[PDB]
Amino acid sequence: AKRIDAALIVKDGRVVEGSNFENLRDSGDPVELGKFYSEIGIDELSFWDITASVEKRKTMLELVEKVAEQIDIPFTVGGGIHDFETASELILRGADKVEINTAAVENPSLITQIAQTFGSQAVVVYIAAKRVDGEFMVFTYSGTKNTGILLRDWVVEVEKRGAGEIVLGSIDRLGTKSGYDTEMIRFVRPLTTLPIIAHRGAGKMEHFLEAFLAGADAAKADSVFHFREIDVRELKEYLKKHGVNVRLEGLGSLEHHHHHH
């Protein structure tokens, strides 16, 4: 059952670089945009906060509270979640799950803490990996620091520690539009039973097919959606046409059988 997720980069309650959806009242509003995606075919949402100010904690708490009120699809919260306290806060305020990265690499017991308390399904681990001298290596601090940890070991450990899902983002595909890193997805696939979520590289609908053929369970994208390079309904219909098990329930939820001229 392949999943299509939309990720929103958010800063001080705003979608960073907004979106091209004219129909919205405010195309930089995270909650409105997010509700929109939920009503046109997105399976799950991610909100990633990069608010650098002192206000970050409450800013993120306020985001998930608004989002849980307005939206009925599963969503993930992430950004700079660094301990159990803030992770607990965010889940309790409404987050179906939290997306952790650097804090997990620094302290893998953190995966286990959250999972033991809120269930493993509330724990998503984002893995930023990059080819370094012929090996997949794990990077932290916004894909800047090489931890010296191999991808193949970090994957095994993350499942061991009790994560529900792994988001697998290729630094080697950052900024690009030539496709998901299907090599990296095929590498990781035999190493875990967890849901693998692909990120970075997506540029056209066929990229999503390739990702799923590689064995991804879900595929995340952001600007390709926000900027409408790919229409979500079009994407879902394309996948289904070529035999991919995708959910169509969410399609056309905003449309009606009347005609408003």
Next chain:
Amino acid sequence: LAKRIDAALIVKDGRVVEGSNFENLRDSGDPVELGKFYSEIGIDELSFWDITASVEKRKTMLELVEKVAEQIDIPFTVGGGIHDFETASELILRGADKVEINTAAVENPSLITQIAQTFGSQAVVVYIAAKRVDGEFMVFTYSGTKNTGILLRDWVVEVEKRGAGEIVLGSIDRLGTKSGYDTEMIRFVRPLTTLPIIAHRGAGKMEHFLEAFLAGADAAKADSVFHFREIDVRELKEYLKKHGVNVRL
């Protein structure tokens, strides 16, 4: 207040599955003659539910609605694995008053809206096959075979929202039974929708119909109980009228 009595014919390869007990007819297995006979003795609407398997399904169903539309003058629905707008569209333009959809609509509720968008809500019937599971009514697809995990109460609301004209509410918990319509299920659904609600499965005797209407049903559908002459359609209409049910006579 006005209550409706429908007969449903299960057909396969142009033939009535397990036929009927109407010796008068020149062919008790012929859907057109059986349906025509039903139309004269007082049935208000017909459903033809095709289970044709092998690759002729699409063509078979179209020949069927063509024949039916020619001989019969009461409304009818056609249904049985109708999976997209184009199919439904052909069938209506070929003479069906209404198309019924189920599994296709559950997986793709937009199908409801597309059809209604063109032909109007009254052209769209949605069949909801439901069963109790762990204390909740659940929606089942693929001929009652797949537990979708979708709650009946959520699906009923969505079905109206999307633009269906009426809901055939078929209880899998009464499948093949004769002890009566699922009036508990019918009562559960009644305040969830403004749409005509049509009861299916459970009917064994005439009183069962009265019960269903008391439960808030707007129409009752039955099949084998009519075909095998356990209930007579005219006697049914007379009974209901007698105890105050606004049926057509």
